[PDB]
Amino acid sequence: ILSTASVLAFERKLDPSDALMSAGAWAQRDASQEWPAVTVREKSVRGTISNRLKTKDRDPAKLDASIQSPNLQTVDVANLPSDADTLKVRFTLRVLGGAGTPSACNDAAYRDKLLQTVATYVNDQGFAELARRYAHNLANARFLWRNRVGAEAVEVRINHIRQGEVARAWRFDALAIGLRDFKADAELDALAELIASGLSGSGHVLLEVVAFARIGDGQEVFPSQELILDKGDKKGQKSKTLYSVRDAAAIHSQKIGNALRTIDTWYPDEDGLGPIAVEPYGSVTSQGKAYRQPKQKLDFYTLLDNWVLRDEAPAVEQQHYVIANLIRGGVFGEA
Amino acid sequence: VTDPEALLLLPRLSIQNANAISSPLTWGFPSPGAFTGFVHALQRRVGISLDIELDGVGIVCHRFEAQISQPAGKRTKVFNLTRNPLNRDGSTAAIVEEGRAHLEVSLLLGVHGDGLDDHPAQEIARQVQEQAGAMRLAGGSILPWCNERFPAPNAELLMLGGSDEQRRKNQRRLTRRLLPGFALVSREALLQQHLETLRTTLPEATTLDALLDLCRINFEPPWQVRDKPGWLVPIPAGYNALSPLYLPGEVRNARDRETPLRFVENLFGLGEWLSPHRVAALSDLLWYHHAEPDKGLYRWSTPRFV
RNA sequence: CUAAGAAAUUCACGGCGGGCUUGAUGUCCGCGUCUACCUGAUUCACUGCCGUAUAGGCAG
Hints:
part of a larger assembly, 2 chains, A: 335 residues, 2 domains, 7-stranded antiparallel β-sheet, 4-stranded mixed β-sheet, 7 helices, 18 strands, B: 306 residues, 3-stranded antiparallel β-sheet, 22% helix, RNA-binding, CRISPR-assoc_prot_Csy2 (chain B)
C-alpha cells in the first residue's frame, strides 16, 4: 500500500564549519592570511532596570529602590582592534552530494520510490534553482548576521579548493547582491553550477568562503553566543558567553548553515520577510511563527507524502522546497 | 583479530562537532566504537573497490576541545548547546542536551588484502583520504584542510619489513609523525586485576566499583593522594545484550528490515591514554570489533596490546 | 554503515565615590679552574681588453 518509512533520516549536505573571524584593514584584504584573530574578552556592564513592570510592582518606592540595586554582569565582548576597520570572517563549505539518498530508510519500496522521485526531479530540473540561491547566500554575506547590518562594504571571496589549491576563485560585492532578490549573474551561475555538480556527484566540493566587512575602527563584531543553561550563582555569573574556537572568535557552523539555507521564498504567507530558512513547518526563530503549517497542505511532510506515495507532484516551487529539505537533512518518521 | 599487512595513516583530521557524550556514564573523548564504525564504513565505501580490508583503528587525538562551560559557583561542568528550530506552533522545542567537541585525531588503519599489490600505496592512501573527507567521525564533520600552509598527506606503511631494524626505523618514522597526541588503548586486564586487589581488600566488589576506583583521585591518611600508573579513563568498551535476537522484519521501527535487531546496553571498560612511543610497535594499539553474537557481548578493544 | 541521522541563544546596559602601610636592622668567614689544539675547506668567480652588443671571445 506504500506506507511511509517509520525511520527517515537524511544527512546534511552543504556542511559548513565554524566561521573564524579575524581583523585587519581594508585595501590589504589580499594579504589577509596573517590577520590577527578577533579575541573574545570580558567586560563589566552595569545597567538599570528596563523590562516591563508587572502592574503590581509599579509603585515608585520599589522602582526607585530597585534602580539603587543594579544588575552587574560580566559579558563577553568581541571587538575589532582600534587600528582595524575590517572584519574577515572565514569558513569552509563541503557540498557533499547524494542529495536524495537517505541515510536511513526502512522500506525498500519507499526508498526506491523516493530515489525515483528525486531522479525525476533532477532530470526534469536539476539543482539549478536551489544552488543558485545557495550561491546567493554565499555571495551576499548573509552568514555575516549582525556583522553585515551597518558595514560600509562587504566583499565575499569564494575559492573552489581542489586537491591542493584554488581551482577557481570568485569575488563578489555582497551589498549589491541583496538579501532578498535571487537574480541572475554569470559568476553566480558558475558558482551555482559548481554547487550543483557537488550536490549531484558522488564526492564533495570544497569551497573557502571569506567575507570582509568594513565596519569601522574598534567597532563591535557579533560572533555567535553560546546556549548555556545553568549559568550558576549570580555573583560570578557571566551573563553572555561568545563562541570562540581557539582564542579566536567564531560563528557556529549551524548558524552559517542556517544563513545558507535561507532560500525559501515559496511559503504561502506574504513575503514581508522575503526568504526564510528551509525547515519542515517553516519556522522563523526570530519571528516566533511557523509558516508552512500542516493545516495547509504546504509543509515538507505532506508534500513529500503526496509526491512520493501517491505521486501528486506539487508545483516546481514546493518541490524545490522539498529537495531543499532533503539537502538540509532531518530525522523524520512516525511511530 | 588478524594482523595488518600494512598500516595506513590518516593524518590529523579536524572534526568539528563530535559526540562528547561517549556513554551514559562517561563524557569527553568519543567512544572507540565511533572510530571502529568509521573504519568499517570506510571499508564498506572504498575498501571493497580497492580489494583491501580496512580493519582496526588506532586513535591519537592531537587536539581536543569540548564545548563545555563551568558554571559560576559550581565545581562541575555543563554543555554548551545549539538552538533547534521551533515547533509548528511557534514554541521553543524541549532541549535535548548533546555534547559537542572539536577533535584533531589521526587514525592508524590496519590494511590487509590483495589490493596492496594491485595498486600503489599512495593511491589507496589518497583514495581512503578523499573518501574520508566526505565522511563524519563521531557525528562531526571532517574539516578538509583548505588553504593552510600545506595539506597533511597520508602514508601507508607496509608492516612487512625486510629487516627488524628497518621495521623499527619506519615505526619510529610514523611515531614521530603522530607524536603531539596520545594513543588510546584498552586496559581491561588492569581493570580485572584491580578488581582482584579490591576483592582481597573487601569481598563482594563489582568491577564497576573497581573502574570507579581507577577513575577517582583517592586521598589517603598518613595526607597523600594515591598515585596511578597512567591516565586511566573510563571508556564504553562495547555493548551487552538485553533482549533476545529479533528477526529482521519482526521488530518495529528499525533502521533496516533486513538486519536482526537486539536491544543492547553499554559495557564500560577501562582505557589508558598513552603516548605512541610507549608501545614500541604501532601494529598494536588498533581497535577491532569482537561480536560473539550468540551470547550478546558486542564489544571493541585493542587486543595484541601487551 | 560511527548513542547513527537534524538544529540561529539574542536583544539592551554608567561600577564609582574615598583613603598616610609605617618604624628598625652587620650577610660573612674560606677557596688552584686546569689540560691540548691546522680555520682552511680551489672560499678573492678578479681586473681589464676586442666587439655595436647584454651575443661571443681574449690577456694575466
